[PDB]
Design an enzyme around this catalytic site. Structure first.
Site, PDB file in Angstrom:
ATOM      1  N   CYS A  51       0.820  -1.215   0.000  1.00 25.68           N
ATOM      2  CA  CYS A  51       0.000   0.000   0.000  1.00 25.68           C
ATOM      3  C   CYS A  51       0.848   1.257   0.000  1.00 25.68           C
ATOM      4  O   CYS A  51       1.581   1.504   0.938  1.00 25.68           O
ATOM      5  CB  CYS A  51      -0.957   0.028   1.229  1.00 25.68           C
ATOM      6  SG  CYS A  51      -1.970   1.557   1.297  1.00 25.68           S
TER       7      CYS A  51
ATOM      8  N   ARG B 258       0.034   4.630   2.833  1.00 24.21           N
ATOM      9  CA  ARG B 258       0.063   4.404   4.275  1.00 24.21           C
ATOM     10  C   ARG B 258       0.470   5.638   5.109  1.00 24.21           C
ATOM     11  O   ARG B 258       0.418   5.589   6.328  1.00 24.21           O
ATOM     12  CB  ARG B 258       0.944   3.196   4.628  1.00 24.21           C
ATOM     13  CG  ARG B 258       0.352   1.836   4.268  1.00 24.21           C
ATOM     14  CD  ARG B 258       1.401   0.747   4.556  1.00 24.21           C
ATOM     15  NE  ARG B 258       2.385   0.603   3.477  1.00 24.21           N
ATOM     16  CZ  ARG B 258       3.540  -0.029   3.613  1.00 24.21           C
ATOM     17  NH1 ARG B 258       3.858  -0.577   4.790  1.00 24.21           N
ATOM     18  NH2 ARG B 258       4.380  -0.117   2.577  1.00 24.21           N
TER      19      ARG B 258
ATOM     20  N   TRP C  24      -9.196   6.241  -0.971  1.00 23.00           N
ATOM     21  CA  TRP C  24      -9.476   6.990  -2.187  1.00 23.00           C
ATOM     22  C   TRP C  24      -8.428   6.609  -3.218  1.00 23.00           C
ATOM     23  O   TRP C  24      -7.361   6.088  -2.886  1.00 23.00           O
ATOM     24  CB  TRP C  24      -9.509   8.515  -1.943  1.00 23.00           C
ATOM     25  CG  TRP C  24      -8.251   9.054  -1.362  1.00 23.00           C
ATOM     26  CD1 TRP C  24      -7.052   9.289  -2.041  1.00 23.00           C
ATOM     27  CD2 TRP C  24      -8.011   9.407  -0.003  1.00 23.00           C
ATOM     28  NE1 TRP C  24      -6.115   9.759  -1.175  1.00 23.00           N
ATOM     29  CE2 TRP C  24      -6.662   9.850   0.081  1.00 23.00           C
ATOM     30  CE3 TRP C  24      -8.799   9.397   1.168  1.00 23.00           C
ATOM     31  CZ2 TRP C  24      -6.089  10.291   1.291  1.00 23.00           C
ATOM     32  CZ3 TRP C  24      -8.226   9.852   2.369  1.00 23.00           C
ATOM     33  CH2 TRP C  24      -6.896  10.286   2.416  1.00 23.00           C
TER      34      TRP C  24
ATOM     35  N   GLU D 104      -4.598   3.733 -11.030  1.00 26.42           N
ATOM     36  CA  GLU D 104      -5.412   2.536 -10.838  1.00 26.42           C
ATOM     37  C   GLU D 104      -6.533   2.467 -11.906  1.00 26.42           C
ATOM     38  O   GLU D 104      -6.704   1.458 -12.621  1.00 26.42           O
ATOM     39  CB  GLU D 104      -5.979   2.502  -9.402  1.00 26.42           C
ATOM     40  CG  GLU D 104      -4.909   2.491  -8.287  1.00 26.42           C
ATOM     41  CD  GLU D 104      -5.497   2.449  -6.871  1.00 26.42           C
ATOM     42  OE1 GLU D 104      -5.828   1.333  -6.405  1.00 26.42           O
ATOM     43  OE2 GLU D 104      -5.616   3.513  -6.216  1.00 26.42           O
TER      44      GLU D 104
HETATM   45  C1  HEM Z   1      -6.158   6.672   1.714  1.00 25.03           C
HETATM   46  C2  HEM Z   1      -5.974   6.325   0.447  1.00 25.03           C
HETATM   47  C3  HEM Z   1      -5.266   5.046  -0.047  1.00 25.03           C
HETATM   48  C4  HEM Z   1      -4.511   5.024  -1.141  1.00 25.03           C
HETATM   49  C5  HEM Z   1      -4.201   6.225  -2.087  1.00 25.03           C
HETATM   50  C6  HEM Z   1      -4.057   3.668  -1.314  1.00 25.03           C
HETATM   51  C7  HEM Z   1      -3.265   3.194  -2.319  1.00 25.03           C
HETATM   52  C8  HEM Z   1      -3.111   1.856  -2.629  1.00 25.03           C
HETATM   53  C9  HEM Z   1      -2.703   1.330  -3.929  1.00 25.03           C
HETATM   54  C10 HEM Z   1      -2.460   2.169  -5.210  1.00 25.03           C
HETATM   55  C11 HEM Z   1      -2.606   0.005  -3.809  1.00 25.03           C
HETATM   56  C12 HEM Z   1      -2.246  -0.996  -4.926  1.00 25.03           C
HETATM   57  C13 HEM Z   1      -3.564  -1.712  -5.157  1.00 25.03           C
HETATM   58  C14 HEM Z   1      -3.724  -2.193  -6.558  1.00 25.03           C
HETATM   59  O1  HEM Z   1      -2.849  -1.908  -7.425  1.00 25.03           O
HETATM   60  O2  HEM Z   1      -4.748  -2.885  -6.771  1.00 25.03           O
HETATM   61  C15 HEM Z   1      -2.926  -0.362  -2.446  1.00 25.03           C
HETATM   62  C16 HEM Z   1      -2.925  -1.635  -1.923  1.00 25.03           C
HETATM   63  C17 HEM Z   1      -3.374  -2.000  -0.660  1.00 25.03           C
HETATM   64  N1  HEM Z   1      -3.768  -1.158   0.365  1.00 25.03           N
HETATM   65 FE1  HEM Z   1      -4.009   0.908   0.111  1.00 25.03          FE
HETATM   66  N2  HEM Z   1      -4.477   2.911  -0.239  1.00 25.03           N
HETATM   67  C18 HEM Z   1      -5.301   3.716   0.527  1.00 25.03           C
HETATM   68  C19 HEM Z   1      -5.999   3.294   1.648  1.00 25.03           C
HETATM   69  C20 HEM Z   1      -5.932   2.042   2.268  1.00 25.03           C
HETATM   70  C21 HEM Z   1      -6.650   1.651   3.467  1.00 25.03           C
HETATM   71  C22 HEM Z   1      -7.674   2.578   4.183  1.00 25.03           C
HETATM   72  C23 HEM Z   1      -6.293   0.393   3.762  1.00 25.03           C
HETATM   73  C24 HEM Z   1      -6.742  -0.532   4.917  1.00 25.03           C
HETATM   74  C25 HEM Z   1      -7.563  -0.172   5.909  1.00 25.03           C
HETATM   75  C26 HEM Z   1      -5.352  -0.061   2.753  1.00 25.03           C
HETATM   76  C27 HEM Z   1      -4.705  -1.286   2.669  1.00 25.03           C
HETATM   77  C28 HEM Z   1      -4.223  -1.879   1.486  1.00 25.03           C
HETATM   78  C29 HEM Z   1      -3.979  -3.278   1.251  1.00 25.03           C
HETATM   79  C30 HEM Z   1      -4.199  -4.506   2.176  1.00 25.03           C
HETATM   80  C31 HEM Z   1      -3.426  -3.353  -0.174  1.00 25.03           C
HETATM   81  C32 HEM Z   1      -3.054  -4.611  -0.982  1.00 25.03           C
HETATM   82  C33 HEM Z   1      -4.402  -5.021  -1.626  1.00 25.03           C
HETATM   83  C34 HEM Z   1      -4.321  -6.331  -2.369  1.00 25.03           C
HETATM   84  O3  HEM Z   1      -3.428  -7.179  -2.040  1.00 25.03           O
HETATM   85  O4  HEM Z   1      -5.136  -6.510  -3.321  1.00 25.03           O
HETATM   86  N3  HEM Z   1      -5.142   0.979   1.898  1.00 25.03           N
HETATM   87  N4  HEM Z   1      -3.141   0.800  -1.725  1.00 25.03           N
HETATM   88  C1  LIG Z   2      -4.583 -12.302  -7.133  1.00 21.02           C
HETATM   89  C2  LIG Z   2      -4.757 -11.032  -6.316  1.00 21.02           C
HETATM   90  C3  LIG Z   2      -4.070 -10.921  -5.107  1.00 21.02           C
HETATM   91  C4  LIG Z   2      -4.185  -9.772  -4.328  1.00 21.02           C
HETATM   92  N1  LIG Z   2      -3.511  -9.695  -3.142  1.00 21.02           N
HETATM   93  N2  LIG Z   2      -4.996  -8.764  -4.762  1.00 21.02           N
HETATM   94  C5  LIG Z   2      -5.686  -8.832  -5.946  1.00 21.02           C
HETATM   95  C6  LIG Z   2      -6.561  -7.649  -6.368  1.00 21.02           C
HETATM   96  C7  LIG Z   2      -6.052  -6.932  -7.639  1.00 21.02           C
HETATM   97  C8  LIG Z   2      -4.636  -6.345  -7.488  1.00 21.02           C
HETATM   98  N3  LIG Z   2      -4.661  -5.121  -8.294  1.00 21.02           N
HETATM   99  C9  LIG Z   2      -5.940  -4.886  -8.952  1.00 21.02           C
HETATM  100  C10 LIG Z   2      -6.897  -5.739  -8.118  1.00 21.02           C
HETATM  101  O1  LIG Z   2      -7.229  -4.978  -6.958  1.00 21.02           O
HETATM  102  C11 LIG Z   2      -8.575  -4.530  -6.842  1.00 21.02           C
HETATM  103  C12 LIG Z   2      -8.606  -3.549  -5.664  1.00 21.02           C
HETATM  104  N4  LIG Z   2      -7.697  -2.429  -5.925  1.00 21.02           N
HETATM  105  C13 LIG Z   2      -7.385  -1.417  -4.931  1.00 21.02           C
HETATM  106  C14 LIG Z   2      -8.535  -0.410  -4.823  1.00 21.02           C
HETATM  107  F1  LIG Z   2      -8.894   0.091  -5.999  1.00 21.02           F
HETATM  108  F2  LIG Z   2      -9.619  -1.027  -4.346  1.00 21.02           F
HETATM  109  C15 LIG Z   2      -8.099   0.686  -3.870  1.00 21.02           C
HETATM  110  C16 LIG Z   2      -7.358   1.808  -4.259  1.00 21.02           C
HETATM  111  C17 LIG Z   2      -6.968   2.811  -3.355  1.00 21.02           C
HETATM  112  C18 LIG Z   2      -7.335   2.644  -2.018  1.00 21.02           C
HETATM  113  C19 LIG Z   2      -8.080   1.522  -1.642  1.00 21.02           C
HETATM  114 CL1  LIG Z   2      -8.639   1.237   0.029  1.00 21.02          CL
HETATM  115  C20 LIG Z   2      -8.456   0.545  -2.545  1.00 21.02           C
HETATM  116  C21 LIG Z   2      -5.587  -9.981  -6.747  1.00 21.02           C
END
Ligand code: HEM
Ligand SMILES: Cc1cc(N)nc(C[C@@H]2CNC[C@@H]2OCCNCC(F)(F)c2cccc(Cl)c2)c1
Ligand code: HEM
Ligand SMILES: Cc1cc(N)nc(C[C@@H]2CNC[C@@H]2OCCNCC(F)(F)c2cccc(Cl)c2)c1
Ligand SMILES: C[C@H](O)[C@H](O)[C@H]1CNc2nc(N)[nH]c(=O)c2N1
Ligand SMILES: C[C@H](O)[C@H](O)[C@H]1CNc2nc(N)[nH]c(=O)c2N1
Ligand SMILES: [Zn+2]
Lengths: 410, 412
Positions: free
Chosen positions: A109, A112, A281, A286
């Site tokens: 993330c 953070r 947000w 993305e």
């Molecule tokens: C405040 C604005 C936030 C921004 C701009 C942001 C940004 C991002 C981005 C760009 C990713 C990559 C996700 C992707 O490519 O699909 C990500 C992943 C992630 N973030 Fe954030 N984030 C935010 C808030 C949060 C919050 C509120 C949480 C938890 C309470 C969180 C926890 C996570 C987790 C667990 C991942 C990995 C998701 C996955 O494995 O699919 N983030 N974040």
């Molecule tokens: C196989 C697999 C493993 C994992 N760990 N995650 C995925 C999800 C896959 C990995 N990138 C695309 C898809 O994400 C969809 C959610 N994207 C983040 C968001 F848009 F929801 C987002 C963005 C900013 C902030 C927040 Cl809280 C949330 C797939």
């Protein structure tokens, strides 16, 4: 054992000590790095108390009361509760701290810097899918806040014997439907075809359009999941236009303002929260890079490039690259004009470098997964490209879990 | 054992068995991944013979002669050479196979589809810095080929006691000087400031311009290095202009056509070749993204975006991204217009994916470092972004080695 990370742009070197408190496995060995792999029977009384103790120690440490009577009394109380009940219940303060730290520990993330400002909605009293739906509408409305987005998480009841899981079947709370067409092509979001099929076969009346907000499919207490539509008025959407290109708006593109991940598992003190939807947000890329331009997604590069009248005859004219930037200019412009919080990748990664520096200074490190943190466009002109990162797993944590339709029996 | 990799765009799944041949360590453990860390005397007889043997077994399998009399004889001959002289010499055929395989095994290289087409220049009879200079000139001329670039490598004598090392002090055979000014600004390439100061101290007369080709600083046989100027007629350069923007040429940009890495160590069969300059051709982003647009390099983004009249008051206009693309269009255009080989990042990554899939079928794997293989712009619109990769170390290999000015024993 004590590790250095260097930024190659600035020469700043940081020392990581936090990794020694890591616990879970990475997938990497001394012989093989699995850094680019996306994915590299409940806890017995024996396994749970080490996990609770580890968590409670870090908790009491954070409130500067380590080894105090109140610290010892809580360990006592929890020990008693586990041996007698086979699990335990977190105090509100512990649940809030654990949720914020799961975010703080999320190595993938970039956002953070925000981790301590997180609104936690305690939904452990929920018992039905209808209850889940209410909690989720309230989360959606609170987080959306008419465009001025606020980070939030809603936490449903913990796993018990594992036969009574709470799960949101959707991967995000707000996502667009996907349908395979007689034409052979795909209408809507190709990533959601399977889920959309499961929705229709549970009864959803698909509008059969390009941007149909999917219904929620909620599972309470290990029961069969149920369908609910989010009130259309709670789903804030943004029509996509370009500040220079008149024709852009004619592509008919929109996206939703609230990114809300709903398929992850929150682990706190050995307790597992299988339904814990959270939202923040968007970072613009993305939507503009991944959602709109992935070949397997909306895949709109060809169309945009054509309306720009770029030379599409050779890859070397960089037409894909030109059109990519424009699509990303349009995403950001449209969110900004409609006053819906969004962050660009320059600003987000700059903040993350500042966050990393704070976490090294104040905590001894910051687990970070460079493959995910570096934006999907313009990598090397963002500061994170030049920053070495160490990736390791700390708890409390968010973990990916498999789609429940694979698991569930009806 | 088997390891699977998935492509998330195609759903193609591949199976790696080749990782079972990997010996060297990665830097990673079950507890920490060091995949984005850039850097994560002689060998004894008993560590050398196993390495020699592993190598010769691989070489003889490749030629379909494993277990032959020729194979057994060469093992015995090398065994005897090691016990008597404490090292051994590669045959020409072995050196060639070795150099090609080190490229094949280079996990950070996107250009590897080309690995079996490599011109090997055996410079193991070289004895002096002057001799090194001549070999490197011939390499530059051959590789350049008037713009029709050809991959090549020149291999100087191997390490003996580690007190007699051949070394090319330049990190690349062709690069531009950097000069730090008293006001703190930099003229020319800021990455080469320290090296430029060494050359000057060694007696180089610096022109003090923005694009001054550096002299070669060459160390033979552990002696103090010596300065040589590459004949300018051997250094092909490309003035940079833009197909639509006529003001682009007046930025005064140019670059050299021949990318030629000179600071790496080549290991073949436990032998160490500390001077082994090699060259191919550029992928455009190397110059247009990194060389021109890194903040620690020529850093031209602002000046380009200024001339394009972009809105520069907020990062969210994506002005940097816009200028970046136009600079990279210019690089590819200019090289193409002058008929100097270059490859764009779309075509290179697409080729690499085909190479990787082929390697999985015929070899059982293809070690790949995703952090490096994914290009520094437009990452996710290239097919490599979506490809899972397994990074591990095979030999023969190229390794980073520390800069020689840190370790060199000055003789005076
Ligand atoms: C405040 C604005 C936030 C921004 C701009 C942001 C940004 C991002 C981005 C760009 C990713 C990559 C996700 C992707 O490519 O699909 C990500 C992943 C992630 N973030 Fe954030 N984030 C935010 C808030 C949060 C919050 C509120 C949480 C938890 C309470 C969180 C926890 C996570 C987790 C667990 C991942 C990995 C998701 C996955 O494995 O699919 N983030 N974040
Ligand atoms: C196989 C697999 C493993 C994992 N760990 N995650 C995925 C999800 C896959 C990995 N990138 C695309 C898809 O994400 C969809 C959610 N994207 C983040 C968001 F848009 F929801 C987002 C963005 C900013 C902030 C927040 Cl809280 C949330 C797939
Ligand atoms: C033929 C055209 C080639 C192309 C387009 C190409 C492309 C590249 C690129 C873009 C990189 C990353 C470089 C960087 O970011 O600095 C790289 C790395 C590398 N390549 Fe190639 N390559 C080519 C030929 C070769 C040859 C001939 C060899 C050796 C015989 C080679 C061996 C290596 C090695 C060892 C690295 C890692 C370099 C380092 O660690 O600094 N490549 N390749
Ligand atoms: C700390 C450190 C470790 C390592 N392993 N490499 C480097 C070198 C770092 C890695 N990216 C910048 C610098 O390379 C400059 C040379 N670029 C490659 C090239 F241009 F020479 C090139 C390009 C295409 C083909 C060939 Cl044969 C050669 C630094
Ligand atoms: C195979 C590779 O790990 C995969 O494509 C990753 C790369 N980096 C990513 N980075 C982010 N933020 N999100 C992603 O979905 C991915 N996908
Ligand atoms: C910290 C990080 O490992 C470093 O900046 C890397 C990232 N990827 C790269 N990829 C290539 N091709 N060349 C590089 O120099 C780098 N630098
Ligand atoms: Zn690793």
């Amino acid at each position: 054992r004590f590790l250095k990370v260097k930024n190659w742009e600035t020469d700043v070197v940081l020392t990581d000590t936090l990794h020694l408190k890591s616990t879970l496995e990475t997938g990497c060995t001394e012989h093989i790095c699995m850094g680019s792999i996306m994915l590299p029977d409940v806890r017995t009384k024996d396994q749970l108390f080490p996990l609770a103790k580890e968590f409670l120690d870090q908790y009491y440490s954070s409130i500067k009361r380590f080894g105090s009577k109140a610290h010892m009394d809580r360990l006592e109380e929890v020990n008693k509760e586990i041996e007698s009940t086979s699990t335990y219940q977190l105090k509100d303060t512990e649940l809030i701290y654990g949720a914020k730290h799961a975010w703080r520990n999320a190595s993938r993330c970039v956002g953070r810097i925000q981790w301590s400002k997180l609104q936690v909605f305690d939904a452990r009293d929920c018992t039905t899918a209808h209850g889940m739906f209410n909690y989720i509408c309230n989360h959606v409305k609170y987080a959306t806040n008419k465009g001025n987005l606020r980070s939030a998480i809603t936490i449903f009841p913990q796993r018990t014997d594992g036969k009574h899981d709470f799960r949101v079947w959707n991967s995000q709370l707000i996502r667009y439907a996907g349908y395979k067409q007689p034409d052979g092509s795909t209408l809507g979001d190709p990533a959601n075809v399977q889920f959309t099929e499961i929705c229709i076969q549970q009864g959803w009346k698909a509008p059969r359009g390009r941007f149909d907000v999917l219904p929620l499919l909620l599972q309470a207490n290990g029961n069969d999941p149920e369908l609910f539509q989010i009130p259309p008025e709670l789903v804030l959407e943004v029509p996509i236009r370009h500040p220079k290109f008149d024709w852009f708006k004619d592509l008919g593109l929109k996206w939703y303002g609230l990114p809300a991940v709903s398929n992850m598992l929150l682990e706190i003190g050995g307790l597992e929260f299988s339904a814990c939807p959270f939202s923040g947000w968007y970072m613009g890329t993305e939507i503009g890079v991944r959602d709109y331009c992935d070949n397997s997604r909306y895949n709109i590069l060809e169309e945009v490039a054509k309306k720009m009248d770029l030379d599409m005859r050779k890859t070397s004219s960089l037409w894909k690259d030109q059109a990519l930037v424009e699509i990303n200019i349009a995403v950001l412009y449209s969110f900004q004009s409609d006053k819906v919080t969004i962050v660009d990748h320059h600003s987000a990664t700059e903040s993350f470098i500042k966050h990393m520096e704070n976490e090294y200074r104040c905590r001894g490190g910051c687990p970070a997964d460079w493959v995910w943190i570096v934006p999907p466009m313009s990598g090397s002109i963002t500061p994170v490209f030049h920053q070495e990162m160490l990736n390791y797993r700390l708890t409390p944590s968010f973990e990916y879990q498999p789609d429940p339709w694979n698991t569930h029996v009806w």
